[PDB]
Design a protein around this ligand. Structure first.
Ligand SMILES: [Mg+2]
Ligand SMILES: [Zn+2]
Lengths: 151, 77, 58, 580, 233, 693, 226
């Protein structure tokens, strides 16, 4: 609420009107990372950048094993840091720090799943947005029986 | 005599989506244009123009007119 | 006098000083560099007029 | 054979800045002579295009799929609504709005000929207007044929009837001018008779209603008719700019004389050393700001409705009141270098013409403004790119979630005594969203779940007496992959529910980054102290989105308790002691 | 010197009075001359007849109520001015209309004098309740064009007589537009489109023929000055 | 250009290193640097122009003159003050009133002091007054009349476009303008001036021969239809008579864009400030065919492009006539040595000089071998790389220059023959040309109307240009309305004599009281004609016909219509504004690509107008196409139509044959990326679902 | 109600400038007739003007003739102002020849039979002692304006340069309405059309041609109906 209200009070001061869902998308993409602590039983490093869904999956699999879950705090991070810290290293390589993330990928030997749009623009495949989705490209067309009966 | 002659909302209510509509009409137009390129080979799986045809127009016009007429359907694989 | 074509002026106030040469910024500087006859004429005119002027060519 | 080929084959037109989604619009080409691309005026404002040597590139969709996406997704008759706020953008304002204003305004200051005479139909009125005995704007009783829908306000005050009758499809008489009858001849027959001053804002509302309640081809036809008639009547509208049309207030002379007299009194008061230079400067800029506001009010009180400058600035056509204020009235206070204020303001108007040094101090502000807008558009592009990277790869990928959680967005706020008032910014916040659950006040649902919130439903809710609503926004949206269409809300570029697959992230990033050049904000004065003022304008936006600590830090107490100050001489200190 | 393509008028009909006329490609600059001259001679040169003044029994000029009829005198005036008549007397001739008792009165109830004929006996003029007492003597006078309400010392002779607007022209509205067409690789040829609306008494094509005839007669003044040459056919 | 001051370059401040502080106008710039004219691009305020009166120290600081003041009695003495002495003194204005003597007419005068504070001081307290109110402005900015009514931004734009206007066929001096326009072209070196005073013996379009007083003979050779650096012609007309007197410094022959030794950039056009059916919507221009058929706005454009013959490894190419494998009609306009004739009309793709490549690699297919056997091919194997006119270019060959190694002319090493061919076209005004005024108003041309379609005046005079009046309140330059009013007054002269009014008396004492129709008027940049003078002269214009002046005292005139004929409802402002023709022309801005040259390091199409390039599809374009969701259009714009070597040729074949477009492959730039990353010891491998690739 | 046949009254105020009066016109009807006249007289009126020239010793229009004080393009500009009349349908070649010092005018041209110059006082060029000027002016009969790019048919004639021509001999056309002195509420208006043409032909003949064009077009409109 505070972030949305601040940016909307900056924008409303001039007369430009922006709907608040456009801000809410960036804010949702902004608070996605969670910082964890005391991760002695979740067998990963404590006090780094952890994704929310991955952290929840780790919690589920460690309470399935019986171990106590590790604590975590949400981390409001900037657009640049959230852009660099992404799963697909092609998108982060196309951004500012293109030497650090290439070396980071080479050291970590990480291979990127091609879900995304910068990594599908570069290769030249169809982007997975709009017409490029799987549920739209998988249609088969044929005329009806009365149509070919007419001619 | 233009792009706007097929009414777009009729197509939307005939197919309930927009990107499915465009891939649908594009596939139909590709099939029609491949029919015109058969050079008299008589391939059975390639269907000609259903609606009445002028001597020179793009096959996408035939695709949009056919689907606006609503005599053609499809299914998802 | 008859140098310029007729142009009716709406100027209310007079100009005691006329606009100087528009190419002085180039020609005067390069004459200073060359030390030609024009530059030495200028330096002696300024010396007899008392104005400050470089006495050494470029 | 070229003319035979290029028909039914769309091309993509595109401007170099391409700030938002509408920078690429698929048109149908058409052979013309000359060496320039001929472009519809109705769409040039969506390009930010101005015909001052702007060069637009034309790209050709090539395969069947590319030109199909050009025809269906990209056409210029399907992009009425800007995705930034849902407002119409393909109804420009420079010339057609002025024509429709002149066509539909009220007869004030212009001699109304044939004022108050009945007319059988609009054809007879047109014949009378062509004869010359009836002016365009004159209150006349003009009868309308069967099928014309009456105005929204005229249905209940129907012509009184002895037997039961309905004025819904039947003929009727209206107290309206000829011009409003022509304007309703422009709009389609099913639209209610609009019976007011059009201007610009009401024209935007009309175009918004047309787009919301008519198919795309009908909306395109109606805006084309509006364009043609607006140009036709703006030719004959009686707008022009001679220097007699721009009028200075006659009271400005005596107002400036009195203020400079009291300024002279202050100046001889300062000459004795009784006041400092800084205090004198502060009070002088205060009183000169009072003077420029007062002469601006005098200028507003001076001009009539007939002169064309007011006719093109009060209609929403082109211009603001500040520009007319500093053409007719005094230019007011103008800034120095490094953002301060000269005690002596520019007392001369541009119609009167500035002096030498007044024009010099005007150049001080002008060059700083130009450099500011250059750096502003550079940083706006940088912020747009960063937002595009951070906000991409989020796409509507599910039809609907199984969730019911939402956000408690307020709907009624700042209600007075005995009445309820809706929120002022409802149009950008609650609108174009979806309710998480049904709302009941008396055991009956007012609004069903999973519907959009427009004008009528929000008005019904605020009339029934609700204070806050639960809107299903994207922050509460949990899903297996991405976000769903229903939790996102209806798309602002189509007017309907967002289709599955629409790349909402790039649209959001462009919509945030589009008005970055439009902010045009800089801190006017620091007040003589540095750090007291927080960042404003685009630096504030980028500081907010970068999650950085702002330059003015406001600490927040961790818990409730007792707080006291500790004024240590070297450095101040505050101490709060929470209870429990 | 010679015209590249000779034009030809074309008529498309959509209704018994609605008609739109399309002119085949004209020389550049001849679209708008023909359009405006034709519209102005169409609305204001065709002869016709219409009502000029009306007289209602037992009423006053300042008293806007008529007894036995539910609507005001302005509605009755507006209904009279929408009625079509054709006269050949070339002089103001009166027409009678009477009805007693309640009910509906139309133009069919008008008794037409010789030389004056009504063409639309279906439009309503007034409604009656209680006692009828409906007597008017409306003047029919031949005219040309459109003239507003005129006073010629008539209220002084009889106070029940009031002037009324007259639609003398047999056409209602003429809205023309000109669009460009491409012939022999040349886009600057004007295709004039004239849309004429007429009252149902006179067919629109006859009105256009009369307009063309009047234009031929009027511009024959400039032709007769000298025998010159110009490229045609 | 010769008066600009640059802050960039070696030893200076770079554009990247610049900031807000350096670009700001300083209060010490008054009289030393122009605050208006400067490039409006990324380097705004880094490059400024010297002021009109600015001088240079022997040390190198920028000086400026001032009139010395003693005891309130200003003298005829001038001292040039640096940016240092201007602080310890207090500076008056040239606008301060004076009495019959040199004493101040008013004690209270508006002055400036140290730090640029504008606080006044009464009585005899000043010690230096300006020499002219035009001291702050440059030479380009001071050309504009009624600058004091314009905004500074539009003044910047107007001073920045007057350096872009082309010279026309025959140029006429502006009807209204600052009187310093003579000095801005007399001091230009392109206008021929007399070296020594004398009398003219003979005149010609090629030379002026003057016999001087001392008896020497000098002939001033005049450049005719030569090419400037930007391509515009620099022809020089003659204005002196056969036997008239010439004094020293007198203008003999006009330069480009000059009339009668006075400077003339554009034309005077009849302006009608009114919207006109939307063809002048959003800062566009409507203008008559009267400016096409009268050759008003047109210019000569000489375009130069050359080719040379060189001895390479295989052999030397020769300029010749026998072009292989071409029809005889193409080579109908060549000379014996392979040179196009002077005056030969050329079009796109035509031959100018015939150069034949001595040898190309010969790998003949059997099909081509049998075709050669059928037809018979010339025995010398040569390739057609002769010089041809580029696309979209027409002109007359006006001059050819041939250089030969075998002659005494010097040539660069390797080459043997060098030929230069000049082609000149008389470009007329058309759609898309960019026109502008002096006050920063500008716009492309949207419709060249016929003469009869224009709104004509009460006497049948059609207006020559139609402007949107929506521009002047928002753009905030009401000085051009003053300019059109004074242009109308300068067309039809005024007779003010004995009117016994304040403006009448001012015009009588100045000399602007008896003015013949058509004579040019002069408003200095800050001493111009006042509003009262314009209104009063509008009241007393000389009659033209019927003894009835045409423009009402309100400044507007009752303007008829051309298309409709009925009068427009209310009077529309008319006047004569100087209209310029910018060099941002439309005949060269047009550029299109289907399949042309390609870049070498990556297989994308290259760029540039002269190289048949393709328009760049930038990053925000891809963002917009993602936003539409049009995956296929974006994907084909990124793969099919560029940088797919197996895709472009197949797609061209499919289009020409008529079959459908094939499926796209992989762009070559991504393969370049993979090969680059693989060489930095990064094991970059692409693996599919089944396995590696 | 009254029907009065319109009558055109012709009065002269100069040789080639005369005013025309149409009195009994209908109300709100004279402005449009005046417009139709003005547009027909200003655009489509037959005439003749120089459409191509040739100067000995000159291969293109951008060079200069040795012995004239101004270049060839200024001669092109001066030729465009030269108004002529030609009854021949075929192009007619005039001849211009002048030698020695002097001032060549339009009167110095040598026109054949059926071709005459109507503004012989027009200045063309100025010749010094070494001035050679032989010039074969071609005149063609046409209407309206045609540019120089539409007048190129031969390429082997290197010395042939086509110019643009201004065929219509009408300078300006002006109309005005008034109030008729006859007393009706209709208030008929007399239309005063002010026509001023060049020296090629009298304004009466110009309006004769324009009225012929308009009456032919309006008769074409009328004839296909009934
Ligand atoms: Mg622009
Ligand atoms: Zn959801």
């Amino acid at each position: 609420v505070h972030l949305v209200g601040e940016v909307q009070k900056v924008y409303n001061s001039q007369g430009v009107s922006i709907h608040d869902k456009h801000i809410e998308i960036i804010i949702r993409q902004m608070l996605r990372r969670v910082t964890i602590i005391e991760s002695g039983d979740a067998e990963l490093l404590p006090g780094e950048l952890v994704e929310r869904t991955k952290f929840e999956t780790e919690n589920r699999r460690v309470v399935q094993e019986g171990g106590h879950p590790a604590s975590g705090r949400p981390q409001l991070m900037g657009i640049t840091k959230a852009s660099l810290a992404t799963e697909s290293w092609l998108s982060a390589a196309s951004f500012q720090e293109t030497t650090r993330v290439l070396t980071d990928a080479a050291i970590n030997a990480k291979s990127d799943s091609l879900i995304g749009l910068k990594e599908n623009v570069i290769i030249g495949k169809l982007i997975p947005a709009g017409t490029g989705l799987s549920r739209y490209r998988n249609i088969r067309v044929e005329p009806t029986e009365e149509a070919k009966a007419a001619m | 005599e233009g792009i706007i002659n097929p009414p777009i909302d009729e197509l939307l209510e005939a197919t309930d989506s927009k990107y499915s509509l465009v891939i649908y009409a594009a596939k139909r137009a590709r099939q029609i244009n491949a029919y015109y390129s058969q050079l008299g080979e008589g391939l059975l799986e390639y269907v000609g123009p259903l609606v009445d045809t002028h001597v020179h127009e793009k096959p996408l016009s035939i695709a949009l007119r056919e689907i606006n007429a609503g005599l053609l359907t499809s299914e998802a694989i | 006098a008859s140098t310029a074509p007729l142009r009716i002026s709406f100027a209310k106030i007079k100009e005691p000083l006329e606009v100087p040469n528009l190419l002085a910024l180039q020609t005067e500087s390069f004459d200073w560099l060359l030390g030609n006859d024009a530059w030495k004429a200028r330096v002696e005119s300024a010396l007899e007029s008392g104005q400050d002027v470089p006495t050494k060519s470029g | 054979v070229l003319e035979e080929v290029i028909a039914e084959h769309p091309v993509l037109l595109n401007r170099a800045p391409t700030l938002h989604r509408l920078g690429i619009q698929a048109f149908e080409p058409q052979l013309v002579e000359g060496k320039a691309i001929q472009i519809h005026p109705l769409v040039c404002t969506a390009f930010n295009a101005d015909f001052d040597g702007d060069q637009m590139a034309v790209h050709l969709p090539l395969s069947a799929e590319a030109q199909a996406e050009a025809r269906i997704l990209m056409l210029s008759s399907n992009n009425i609504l800007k995705p930034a706020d849902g407002r119409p953008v393909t109804m420009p304002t420079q010339d057609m709005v002025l024509g429709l204003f002149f066509l539909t305004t009220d007869s004030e200051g212009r001699s109304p000929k044939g004022e108050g005479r009945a007319f059988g139909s609009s054809a007879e009125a047109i014949m009378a207007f062509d004869a010359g005995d009836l002016t365009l704007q004159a209150k006349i009783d003009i009868r309308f044929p069967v099928g014309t829908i009456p105005p929204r306000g005229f249905e209940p005050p129907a012509r009184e009837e002895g037997e039961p009758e309905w004025q819904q499809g039947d003929t009727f008489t209206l107290k309206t001018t000829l011009g409003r009858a022509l304007f309703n001849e422009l709009l389609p027959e099913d639209y209610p008779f609009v019976d007011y001053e059009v201007g610009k804002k009401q024209l935007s509302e009309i175009v918004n209603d047309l787009a919301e309640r008519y198919p795309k081809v009908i909306v395109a036809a109606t805006l084309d008719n509006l364009k043609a008639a607006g140009f036709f009547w703006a030719t004959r509208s009686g707008v022009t700019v001679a220097i007699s049309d721009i009028v200075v207030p006659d009271a400005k002379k005596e107002i400036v004389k009195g203020y400079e007299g009291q300024d002279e009194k202050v100046q001889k008061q300062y000459e004795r050393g009784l006041i400092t230079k800084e205090e004198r400067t502060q009070e002088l800029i205060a009183i000169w700001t009072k003077a420029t506001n007062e002469v601006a009010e005098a200028m507003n009180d001076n001009f009539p409705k007939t002169n064309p400058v007011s006719m093109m600035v009060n209609s929403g056509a082109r211009g603001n009141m500040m520009q007319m204020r500093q053409i007719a009235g005094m230019r007011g206070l103008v800034s120095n270098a490094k953002n301060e204020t000269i005690p002596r303001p520019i007392k001369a108007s541009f119609r009167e013409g500035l002096s030498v040094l007044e024009y010099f101090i005007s150049t001080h502000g002008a060059r700083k403004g130009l450099a500011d807008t250059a750096l502003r558009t550079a940083d706006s592009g940088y912020l747009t790119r960063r937002l595009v990277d951070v906000s991409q790869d989020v796409i509507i990928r599910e039809e609907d979630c199984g969730t019911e959680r939402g956000l408690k967005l307020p709907i009624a706020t700042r209600d007075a005594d005995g009445t309820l008032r809706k929120a002022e910014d409802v149009e950008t916040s609650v609108y174009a969203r979806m309710l998480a659950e049904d709302v009941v006040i008396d055991g009956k649902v007012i609004a069903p779940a999973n519907v959009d919130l427009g004008d009528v439903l929000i008005d019904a809710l605020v009339a029934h007496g609700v204070e806050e609503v639960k809107t299903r926004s994207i922050l509460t949206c949990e899903s297996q992959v991405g976000t769903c269409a229903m939790c996102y809300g209806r798309s602002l570029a189509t007017g309907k529910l967002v289709d599955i697959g629409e790349a909402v992230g790039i649209i959001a990033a462009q919509s945030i980054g589009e008005p970055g050049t439009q902010l045009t904000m800089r801190t006017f004065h620091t007040g003589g102290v540095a750090g007291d003022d927080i960042t404003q304008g685009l630096p504030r936006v980028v500081e907010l989105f970068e999650a950085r600590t702002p330059k003015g830090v406001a600490p927040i107490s961790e818990a409730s308790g007792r707080v006291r100050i500790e004024e240590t001489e070297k450095t101040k200190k505050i101490v709060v002691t929470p209870d429990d | 010197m010679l015209i590249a393509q000779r034009p030809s008028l074309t008529e498309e009909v959509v209704d018994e009075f609605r008609s739109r006329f399309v002119i085949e490609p004209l020389e550049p600059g001849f679209g708008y001359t023909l359009g405006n001259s034709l519209r102005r001679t169409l609305l204001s040169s065709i002869p016709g007849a219409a009502v000029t003044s009306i007289r209602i029994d037992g009423v006053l000029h300042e008293f806007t109520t008529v007894p036995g009829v539910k609507e005001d005198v302005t509605d009755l005036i507006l209904n009279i001015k929408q009625l079509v008549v054709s006269s050949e007397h070339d002089e103001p001739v009166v027409m009678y209309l009477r009805k007693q008792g309640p009910g509906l009165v139309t133009a069919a109830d008008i008794a037409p004098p010789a030389g004056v004929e009504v063409h639309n006996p279906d439009l309503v003029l007034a409604t009656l309740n209680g006692k009828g007492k409906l007597e008017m003597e409306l003047t029919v006078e031949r005219g040309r064009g459109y003239v507003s309400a005129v006073q010629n010392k008539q209220v002084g002779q009889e106070i029940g007589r009031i002037p009324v607007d007259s639609i003398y022209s047999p056409v209602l509205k003429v809205t023309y537009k000109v669009e460009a067409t491409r012939v022999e690789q040349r886009t600057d040829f004007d295709k004039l489109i004239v849309d004429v609306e007429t009252k149902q008494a006179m067919r629109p094509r006859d009105a256009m023929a009369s307009a063309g005839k009047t234009l031929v007669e009027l511009f024959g003044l400039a032709r007769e000055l000298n025998i010159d040459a110009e490229g045609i056919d | 250009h010769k008066r600009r001051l640059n802050a960039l370059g070696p030893g200076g401040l770079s554009r990247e290193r610049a900031g807000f502080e350096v670009r700001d106008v300083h209060p010490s710039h008054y009289g030393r640097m122009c605050p208006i004219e400067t490039p409006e691009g990324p380097n705004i305020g880094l490059i400024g122009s010297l002021a009109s009166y600015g001088r240079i120290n022997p040390f190198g600081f920028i000086e400026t003159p001032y009139r010395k003041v003693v005891e309130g009695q200003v003298t005829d003495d001038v001292d040039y003050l640096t940016a240092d002495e201007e602080d310890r003194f207090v500076i008056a204005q040239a606008n301060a009133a004076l009495g019959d003597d040199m004493r101040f007419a008013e004690a209270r005068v508006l002055v400036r002091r140290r730090g640029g504070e504008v606080d006044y001081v009464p009585g005899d307290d000043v010690d230096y007054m300006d020499v002219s109110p035009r001291q702050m402005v440059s030479v380009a900015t001071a050309m504009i009349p009624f600058l004091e009514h314009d905004d500074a931004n539009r003044a910047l734009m107007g001073a920045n476009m007057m350096r872009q206007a082309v010279p026309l066929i025959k140029s006429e001096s502006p009807l209204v303008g600052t009187g310093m326009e003579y000095r801005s072209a007399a001091d230009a070196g392109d206008v021929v001036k007399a070296e020594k005073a004398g009398v003219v013996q003979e005149v010609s379009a090629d030379y002026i021969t003057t016999t001087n007083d001392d008896g020497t003979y000098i002939t001033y050779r005049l450049a005719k239809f030569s090419r400037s650096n930007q391509g515009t012609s620099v022809n020089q007309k003659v204005i002196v008579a056969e036997g008239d007197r010439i004094i020293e410094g007198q203008v003999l022959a006009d330069g480009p864009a000059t009339e009668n030794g006075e400077m003339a950039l554009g034309k005077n056009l009849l302006v009608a400030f009114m919207p006109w059916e939307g063809h002048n919507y959003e800062d566009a221009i409507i203008l008559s065919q009267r400016l096409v058929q009268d050759d008003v706005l047109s210019s000569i454009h000489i375009e130069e492009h050359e080719v040379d013959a060189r001895d390479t490894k295989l052999g030397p190419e020769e300029i010749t006539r026998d072009i292989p494998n071409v029809s005889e009609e193409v080579l109908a306009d060549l000379d014996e040595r392979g040179i196009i004739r002077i005056g030969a009309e050329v079009v796109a793709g035509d031959i100018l000089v015939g150069k034949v490549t001595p040898k190309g690699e010969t790998e003949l297919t059997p099909e081509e071998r049998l075709l050669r056997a059928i037809f018979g091919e010339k025995a010398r194997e040569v390739r057609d790389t002769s010089l041809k006119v580029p696309h979209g270019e027409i002109g007359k060959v006006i001059g050819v220059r041939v250089f030969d190694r075998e002659e005494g002319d010097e040539l660069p090493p390797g080459v043997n023959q060098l030929v230069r061919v000049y082609v000149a076209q008389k470009r007329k005004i058309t759609d898309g040309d960019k026109l502008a005024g002096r006050h920063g108003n500008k716009g492309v041309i949207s419709k060249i109307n016929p003469i009869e379609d224009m709104p004509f005046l009460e006497d049948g005079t059609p207006v020559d240009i139609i402007l949107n009046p929506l521009a002047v309140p928002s753009r905030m330059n009401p000085g051009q309305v003053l300019e059109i009013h004074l242009g109308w007054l300068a067309s039809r002269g005024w007779d003010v004599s004995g009117l016994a009014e304040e403006w009448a008396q001012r015009l009588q004492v100045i000399g602007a009281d008896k003015v013949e129709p058509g004579t040019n008027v002069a408003t200095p940049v800050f001493d111009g004609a006042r509003e009262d003078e314009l209104a009063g002269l509008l009241q007393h214009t000389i009659p033209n016909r019927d003894g009835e002046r045409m423009v009402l005292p309100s400044g507007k005139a009752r303007l008829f219509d051309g298309r409709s004929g009925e009068p427009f409802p209310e009077p529309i402002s008319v006047g004569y504004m100087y209209i310029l023709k910018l060099h941002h022309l439309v005949d060269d801005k047009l550029h299109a690509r289907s399949t042309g040259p390609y870049s070498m390091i990556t297989q994308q199409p290259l760029g540039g107008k002269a190289q048949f390039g393709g328009q760049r599809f930038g990053e925000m374009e891809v963002w917009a196409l993602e936003a539409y969701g049009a995956a296929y259009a974006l994907q084909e714009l990124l793969t099919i139509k560029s940088d797919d070597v197996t895709g472009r040729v197949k797609v061209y074949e499919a289009i020409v044959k008529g079959e459908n477009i094939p499926e796209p492959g992989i762009p070559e730039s991504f393969k370049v990326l993979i090969k680059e990353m693989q060489s930095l010891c990064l094991n970059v491998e692409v693996l599919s679902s089944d396995g590696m690739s």
